[PDB]
Amino acid sequence: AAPESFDEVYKGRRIQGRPAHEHGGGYEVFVDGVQLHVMRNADGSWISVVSHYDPVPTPRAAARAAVDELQGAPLLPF
């Protein structure tokens, strides 16, 4: 069963998650309306293409880690 959806403004940016050249995601995340590729690991943790080697517990935590990494930069679609 996929995680719940979420929607919040985090460090001034809108982050959203929802159940649904890259894998076939069962969950989608967006940063200011631009999709952020995210992936679930076997133990239930998550990573994203801007923090791929550093598992975090949830897709919202991956979205927040992406906003922290981007330091204001627009995300580019994959």
Partner 1 sequence: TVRKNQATLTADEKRRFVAAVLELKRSGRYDEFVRTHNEFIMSDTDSGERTGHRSPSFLPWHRRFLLDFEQALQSVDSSVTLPYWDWSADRTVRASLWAPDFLGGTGRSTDGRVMDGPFAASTGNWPINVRVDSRTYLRRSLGGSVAELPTRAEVESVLAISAYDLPPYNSASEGFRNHLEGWRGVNLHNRVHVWVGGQMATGVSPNDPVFWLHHAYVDKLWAEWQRRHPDSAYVPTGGTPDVVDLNETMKPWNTVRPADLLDHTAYYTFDALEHHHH
* Annotated binding-site members for Cu(2+): 22-23, 37, 39, 52-53
User: What's the CA gap between 76 and 26, in Å, rounded?
Assistant: 21
Stretch of 2-10, 11-19, 49-57 contacting partner 1, by CB under 8 A: 49-57
Residue 14 CA to residue 3 CA, distance in Å, equals 18
Which one of 39, 46, 59, 64 is in contact with partner 1 (CB under 8 A)?
39
Instruction: Return the number of other C-beta atoms located less than 10 Å from residue 47's C-beta.
Output: 18
Residues that bind partner 1 (CB under 8 A): 21-24, 37, 39-43, 49-55, 69-71, 73-76, 78
